[PDB]
Design a protein around this motif. Structure first.
Motif, PDB file in Angstrom:
ATOM      1  N   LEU A  14       0.779  -1.235   0.000  1.00  0.00           N
ATOM      2  CA  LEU A  14       0.000   0.000   0.000  1.00  0.00           C
ATOM      3  C   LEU A  14       0.824   1.305   0.000  1.00  0.00           C
ATOM      4  CD1 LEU A  14      -3.025  -1.000   2.218  1.00  0.00           C
ATOM      5  CD2 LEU A  14      -2.690  -1.440  -0.256  1.00  0.00           C
ATOM      6  N   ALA A  15       2.143   1.212   0.176  1.00  0.00           N
ATOM      7  CA  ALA A  15       3.004   2.406   0.047  1.00  0.00           C
ATOM      8  C   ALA A  15       3.292   2.741  -1.397  1.00  0.00           C
ATOM      9  CB  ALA A  15       4.369   2.202   0.799  1.00  0.00           C
ATOM     10  N   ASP A  31       0.999   1.766  -4.176  1.00  0.00           N
ATOM     11  CA  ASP A  31      -0.176   1.422  -4.995  1.00  0.00           C
ATOM     12  C   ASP A  31      -0.736   2.587  -5.815  1.00  0.00           C
ATOM     13  OD1 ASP A  31      -1.532   2.772  -2.963  1.00  0.00           O
ATOM     14  OD2 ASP A  31      -2.908   1.141  -2.556  1.00  0.00           O
ATOM     15  N   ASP A  67      -2.077   5.224  -4.713  1.00  0.00           N
ATOM     16  CA  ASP A  67      -3.292   5.730  -4.084  1.00  0.00           C
ATOM     17  C   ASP A  67      -2.958   6.413  -2.762  1.00  0.00           C
ATOM     18  OD1 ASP A  67      -5.810   6.180  -2.953  1.00  0.00           O
ATOM     19  OD2 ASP A  67      -6.552   4.151  -3.423  1.00  0.00           O
ATOM     20  N   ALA A 119       2.063   6.712   2.905  1.00  0.00           N
ATOM     21  CA  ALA A 119       0.894   6.598   2.004  1.00  0.00           C
ATOM     22  C   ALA A 119       1.318   6.318   0.553  1.00  0.00           C
ATOM     23  CB  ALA A 119       0.020   7.840   2.098  1.00  0.00           C
ATOM     24  N   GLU A 120       2.308   7.054   0.034  1.00  0.00           N
ATOM     25  CA  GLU A 120       2.858   6.782  -1.277  1.00  0.00           C
ATOM     26  C   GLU A 120       4.325   7.146  -1.295  1.00  0.00           C
ATOM     27  OE1 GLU A 120       1.833   5.302  -4.367  1.00  0.00           O
ATOM     28  OE2 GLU A 120       0.398   4.718  -2.797  1.00  0.00           O
ATOM     29  N   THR A 156      -4.454   4.984   0.768  1.00  0.00           N
ATOM     30  CA  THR A 156      -4.029   3.726   1.353  1.00  0.00           C
ATOM     31  C   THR A 156      -2.570   3.895   1.819  1.00  0.00           C
ATOM     32  OG1 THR A 156      -3.156   2.862  -0.706  1.00  0.00           O
ATOM     33  CG2 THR A 156      -5.571   2.431  -0.249  1.00  0.00           C
ATOM     34  N   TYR A 157      -2.179   3.194   2.884  1.00  0.00           N
ATOM     35  CA  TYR A 157      -0.826   3.419   3.429  1.00  0.00           C
ATOM     36  C   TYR A 157      -0.309   2.139   4.066  1.00  0.00           C
ATOM     37  CZ  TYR A 157      -3.739   4.031   7.619  1.00  0.00           C
ATOM     38  OH  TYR A 157      -4.695   3.877   8.602  1.00  0.00           O
TER      39      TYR A 157
END
Ligand SMILES: CC(=O)N[C@H]1[C@@H](O[C@@H]2[C@H](O)[C@@H](O)[C@H](O)O[C@@H]2CO)O[C@H](CO)[C@@H](O)[C@@H]1O
Ligand code: CA
Length: 886
Positions: free
Chosen positions: A23-24, A26, A28, A123-124, A31-32
């Protein structure tokens, strides 16, 4: 550009439910990945090597994050390429980091701070750069040599099997020791001879050769070293202690012995070290420090030494046979500052993972140590096996039976295999134990008959099992692998209980360390069960500092114990650190060589003369004052030196800096101040003795800790009485007092936090930035928060290893008091109520700073004059002048 948008993958070593590593990356922002444990980093693989230009980081909220970013182009070395340590909040635009076109196939991002939570998140993450068209190499598998195949095995066996060769090696080594200790020019002044034991006891002799040389005989290397030491101390007025100050100024001409001396010891063993010593003191030692330590051991009669060096490799080989990859082994094993509690079965993981090249380097250091110990006649105590396994052992070995051991200071203890099982069940204790003892042999060879292991130490859980039967079976298993095994066992806080100890069917093949014999002896129950036991001075807890020693008890209780027992087979030291109060250690080891009580006062008079290279009536007066105050016999229960309030989390009603500590000073403070006045008066005359300077710094910092406590009480009174002006004045003097203390601490290399940190960061050859930063984290945490929040706070470990150290006092202790004081001042002045301070969060902020990006602590002591600092202390920050002062 360009953004690396294909082939990117990610791993992490923990996550909160639903918040997985992937999720880091993705794409998005909603999401994290979020951390669940102390592994607060992720590792991103770029699907090829890119020359990186930019890295952009988004978090899940608007807290303040700090993090460090590392890159590897070879798959092995991760070097630091960017970081955020500013206090800017994260926001919806993300953090953009310029990278100076560094080649990278993998990156690591370690988020060491979130202002809003103990958990961290990403998160990203976007990575930008230029494809090189190359790929990472395969990382080489960890590989170590088997003992039998190394030149160590050849030498060890040659020593064993050829007396003449062995004797020549021992005699040459003892000559090397003289060279290292007092200088090469003295080597040819001694002649060394092996002799036999006297009446079954270790023995040395000292006499004149006939041509102006010193003839020293001894039954082995330790006896010869002890004879050398006896000659130095009694004829040369010389005193060696490489850790705590020495006087090595030799006479212009070798003094004559005169009448020949023969001295024996009634003790089979003289023992050294606590598991804790390997962490509070020795974590970051190189061979040079080990060598020096062993020379001091041999000279002080030590012939039995706890040894865990390179045990990580033993355990790696063992677990590899039970379904564990090397990566999983590295997750189980702690970091370099935590091996004490790892091998006592209290904690796993924390401070790790260790670097891949750790295992070979440490196995080599251990082999090198065994070669030196063999030359001296020092027995190491290696590892016994009692059933320790990772908590996922049954997942990987489904027929194994295990007992959950629960928690220790907020850490999860490893599991324990059921020591026996029912007919029809698989006995993994037998299986793993057989592999463990075999793998220990493959790594180090047959170097000893002594093995240490301590199931149920400071807790755990015996499950459904019979206590005696557990001990019987562990002992039997050890003996199966070494028919001459002796299981060395710590006796601490009534573990092992009598019912456990009664399970040992072979009493002569166990040996119990009475851990705390100079304060809370507990050897009667051992003696009554006919168990061989060792009388030990513990003395030091956590490396905590202060003037504290029990010399009258050592001079009297030890020979009394000998006179009143049949199973006392030794004496020893079990300190948690070797950093304080040299008098205690020298006297303890001196008590091995007498069957009679001695006079601790006259012993001290002679001691200080050889320590300083001179003496006079005033210096003797000051030490008699120390013996009558800080070193005076005590009959109560206490752990380590009385703690300095300077090193406590600020608050009201403080009675200790650590959970099991004590700050009560049981002697008269103004009386003790007289020793400092006397040292100041004699400073100019004694300043050429480094050991004098060492002692003067100790007593002076003790004076200031003592007066700080009195100023603290006055300051708390002023606040409680609503007196703003008095509180400003008194708290002001309290902070100035700490500033003076910092000048005192600056004067000794032993007190510099920068040395501890630099040793950690440089202890291995060619390590990457990742490994340096991680080792620095181990070094900083151990002496402050110890672990993370649930270990420091709920677990009780905060400031357990508090040190009166330079750098650490300015940036950590001082900073805490200043913050608390300012909050109270603001309230007294009519402002808002003083806020609760989250101490752990402030403390951890210091723990996570790095020497290469934040502040580099110095490794050089200052030239401050301790005589002048002592005058300022007496005049302006003392108990004696306190009415005048306040
Ligand atoms: C953290 C540490 O070094 N612990 C030591 C220490 O135990 C602490 C204390 O002294 C005990 O009274 C208490 O019950 O537990 C404390 C936290 O562990 O001393 C013992 C004795 O040497 C060590 O084995 C621990 O490792
Ligand atoms: Ca995401």
């Amino acid at each position: 550009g360009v953004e690396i948008t294909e082939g990117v993958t990610v791993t992490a070593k923990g996550n909160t439910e639903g918040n997985t590593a992937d999720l880091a990356i993705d794409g998005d922002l909603s999401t994290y990945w979020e951390s669940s444990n102390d592994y607060k980093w992720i590792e991103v693989d770029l699907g090829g090597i890119y020359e990186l230009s930019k890295i952009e980081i988004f978090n899940k909220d608007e807290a303040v994050y700090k993090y460090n970013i590392y890159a590897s182009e070879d798959g092995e070395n991760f070097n630091k390429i960017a970081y955020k340590n500013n206090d800017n909040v994260s926001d919806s635009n993300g953090n953009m980091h310029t990278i100076d076109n560094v080649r990278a196939g993998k990156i690591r991002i370690d988020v060491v701070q979130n202002s809003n939570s103990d958990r961290v998140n990403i998160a990203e993450i976007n990575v930008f750069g230029k494809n090189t068209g190359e790929s990472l190499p395969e990382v080489k598998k960890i590989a170590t040599s088997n003992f039998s195949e190394t030149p160590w095995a050849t030498e060890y066996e040659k020593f064993n099997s050829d007396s003449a060769y062995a004797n020549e090696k021992t005699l040459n080594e003892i000559k090397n020791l003289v060279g290292r200790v007092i200088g090469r020019e003295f080597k040819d002044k001694f002649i060394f001879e092996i002799r036999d034991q006297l009446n079954g006891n270790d023995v040395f002799e000292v006499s004149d050769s006939g041509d102006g040389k010193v003839l020293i005989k001894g039954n082995n290397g330790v006896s010869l070293a002890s004879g050398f030491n006896y000659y130095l101390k009694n004829y040369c007025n010389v005193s060696y202690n490489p850790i705590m100050g020495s006087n090595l100024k030799m006479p212009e001409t070798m003094p004559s012995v005169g009448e020949r001396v023969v001295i024996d010891t009634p003790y089979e063993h003289r023992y050294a070290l606590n598991f804790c010593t390997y962490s509070y003191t020795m974590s970051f030692w190189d061979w040079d420090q080990y060598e020096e330590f062993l020379d001091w051991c041999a000279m002080n009669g030590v012939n039995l030494v706890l040894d865990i060096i390179g045990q990580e490799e033993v355990l790696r080989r063992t677990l590899n046979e039970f379904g564990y990859s090397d990566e999983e082994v590295k997750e189980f094993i702690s970091g370099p500052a935590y091996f004490a509690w790892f091998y006592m079965q209290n904690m796993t993981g924390f401070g790790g993972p260790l670097p891949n090249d750790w295992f070979e380097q440490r196995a080599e250091l251990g082999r090198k140590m065994h070669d030196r110990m063999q030359s001296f006649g020092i027995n190491p105590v290696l590892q016994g096996y009692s059933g320790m396994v990772p908590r996922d052992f049954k997942e990987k070995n489904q027929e194994a039976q295990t007992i959950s051991q629960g928690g220790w200071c907020g850490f999860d203890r490893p599991d324990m295999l059921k020591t026996y099982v029912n007919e029809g069940e698989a006995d993994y204790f037998q299986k793993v134990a057989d592999v463990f003892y075999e793998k220990q042999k493959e790594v180090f060879g047959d170097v000893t008959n002594f093995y240490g292991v301590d199931p149920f130490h400071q807790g755990g859980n015996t499950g459904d099992l019979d206590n005696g039967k557990i001990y019987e079976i562990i002992q039997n298993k050890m003996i199966e692998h070494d028919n001459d095994a002796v299981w060395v066992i710590q006796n601490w806080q009534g573990n092992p209980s009598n019912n456990k100890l009664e399970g040992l069917t072979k009493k002569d093949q166990a040996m119990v360390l009475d851990l705390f014999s100079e304060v809370s002896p507990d050897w009667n129950r051992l003696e009554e069960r006919d168990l061989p036991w060792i009388w030990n001075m513990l003395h030091n807890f956590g490396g905590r500092m202060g003037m504290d020693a029990a010399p009258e008890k050592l001079a009297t209780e030890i020979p009394k114990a000998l006179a009143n027992s049949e199973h006392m087979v030794g004496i020893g030291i079990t300190p948690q650190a070797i950093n304080t109060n040299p008098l205690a250690y020298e006297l303890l080891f001196d008590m091995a060589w007498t069957r009679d009580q001695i006079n601790f006062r006259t012993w001290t008079e002679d001691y200080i003369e050889r320590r300083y290279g001179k003496t006079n009536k005033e210096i003797l007066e000051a030490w008699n004052i120390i013996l009558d105050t800080a070193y005076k016999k005590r009959n109560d229960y206490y752990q380590g030196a009385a703690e300095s309030i300077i090193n406590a989390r600020p608050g009201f009603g403080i009675k200790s800096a650590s959970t099991w500590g004590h700050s009560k000073i049981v002697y008269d403070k103004s009386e003790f101040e007289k020793a400092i006045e006397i040292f100041a008066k004699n400073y100019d005359e004694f300043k050429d003795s480094d050991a004098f300077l060492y002692d003067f710094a100790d007593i002076l910092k003790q004076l200031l800790a003592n007066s700080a406590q009195e100023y603290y009480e006055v300051m708390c009174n002023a606040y409680n009485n609503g007196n703003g002006e008095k509180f400003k004045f008194v708290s002001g003097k309290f902070l100035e007092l700490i500033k003076l203390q910092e000048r005192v601490l600056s004067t000794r290399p032993e007190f510099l936090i920068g040395n501890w940190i630099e040793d950690a960061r440089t202890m291995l050859k060619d390590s990457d930035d990742w490994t340096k930063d991680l080792f620095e984290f181990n070094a900083r945490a151990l002496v402050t928060t110890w672990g993370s929040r649930n270990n420091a706070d709920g677990g009780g470990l905060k400031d357990y290893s508090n040190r009166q150290w330079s750098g650490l006092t300015e940036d950590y202790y001082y900073a805490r008091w200043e913050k608390w004081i300012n909050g109270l001042q603001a309230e007294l002045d009519g402002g808002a109520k003083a806020p609760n301070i989250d101490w752990f969060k402030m403390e951890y902020d210091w723990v996570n700073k790095k020497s290469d990006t934040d502040k580099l602590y110095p490794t050089e002591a200052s030239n401050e004059n301790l005589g002048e600092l002592a005058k300022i202390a007496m005049e302006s920050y003392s108990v004696t002048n306190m009415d005048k002062i306040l």
